[PDB]
Design a protein around this ligand. Structure first.
Ligand SMILES: */C(=C(/C#N)C(N)=O)c1cccc(-c2cn[nH]c2)c1
Ligand code: NA
Length: 303
């Protein structure tokens, strides 16, 4: 169902500064010349990536408030211009980490919102397969969890049958190759590991498997081969046992014994947050450092 037409992206929009990334494509700020409104547009090179899987996901699931919403799109025959909502409130992790007053009850509300979003996607047989915090942004500076948006679904995937059919993890019979009943069960928990990395970084101000952008890829991959990230002492003293127990299983090594989004939300730190610290978090603060550390962390994975 795509695509080409008379109208061109140019005709309805003014391009602007490059706002980030990217691997197979470049996102840039733009304006809708009619209303002079601000949007963001990811320009994918068809010769390189195939937008199909991503765009579809966005059409159906964009309705989700906490999911980046798809406001428009074109294909000029060369690239594919996907207009989604521009995010003013900046990066979520980056924002939150500069908050010297932030409480567990408050970090529980953020992660709740994020996992509730991911649980939905999971029952829909869709995996992001890139959850690194740079893809979770704030549509505005309201600082309310309802401004949270998950973004850049370029690397996500639907669960399909061997027949090429939409499917849900509920339905079973209709045939999909066996390895895909595998890679979906991983890619799902793989998202849950990444959320582990967000909650760990959120309660402390450092990422569990890297100190900084300079860490060797081997050492990061090495730290991970183990797990056994430290939940005691330092910035782990004043924190809760509950959340500590939570971060452990979200970050658990076995894709299996590791938590599922659905169970996460059932963990008492998420449900029982009202029993949780309303007071700030002694946290190492190097928002720049942490960012550069995460970057070092994911490159080691994917490269
Ligand atoms: C787009 C790229 C990234 N990352 C990509 N290849 O998807 C991008 C980069 C920064 C910010 C946005 C964005 C989307 N909505 N508002 C801002 C998109
Ligand atoms: Na949305």
């Amino acid at each position: 169902q795509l695509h080409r037409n008379s109208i061109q992206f140019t005709d309805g929009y003014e391009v602007k500064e490059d706002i980030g990334v990217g691997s197979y494509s470049v996102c840039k700020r733009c304006i809708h010349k009619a209303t002079n409104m601000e949007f963001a547009v990811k320009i994918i090179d068809k010769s390189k990536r195939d937008p199909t899987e991503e765009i579809e996901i966005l059409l159906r699931y964009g309705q989700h408030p906490n999911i980046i919403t798809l406001k428009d799109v074109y294909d000029d025959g060369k690239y594919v211009y996907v207009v989604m909502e521009l995010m003013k409130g900046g990066e979520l992790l980056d924002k939150i980490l500069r908050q010297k007053f932030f409480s567990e009850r408050e970090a529980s509300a953020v992660l709740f919102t994020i996992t509730k979003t991911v649980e939905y996607l999971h029952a829909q047989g869709v995996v992001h397969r890139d959850l690194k915090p740079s893809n979770i942004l704030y549509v505005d500076e309201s600082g309310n969890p309802e401004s949270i948006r998950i973004c850049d679904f370029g690397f996500a995937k639907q669960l399909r049958a061997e027949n090429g059919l939409l499917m849900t993890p509920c339905y079973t019979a209709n045939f999909v190759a066996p390895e895909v009943l595998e890679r979906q069960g991983y890619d799902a928990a793989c998202d849950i590991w990444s959320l582990g990395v967000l909650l760990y970084t959120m309660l402390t101000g450092y990422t569990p498997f890297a100190n900084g952008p300079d860490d060797t890829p081997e050492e990061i991959l090495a730290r991970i081969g183990s797990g056994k990230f430290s939940l005691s002492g330092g910035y782990w003293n004043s924190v809760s046992d509950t959340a500590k127990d939570l971060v452990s299983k979200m970050l658990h090594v076995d894709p299996h014994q590791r938590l599922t989004a659905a169970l996460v939300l059932r963990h008492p730190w998420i449900v029982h947050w009202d029993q949780l610290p309303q007071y700030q978090l002694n946290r190492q603060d190097a928002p720049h450092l942490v960012k550069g550390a995460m970057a070092a962390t994911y490159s080691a994975l994917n490269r």
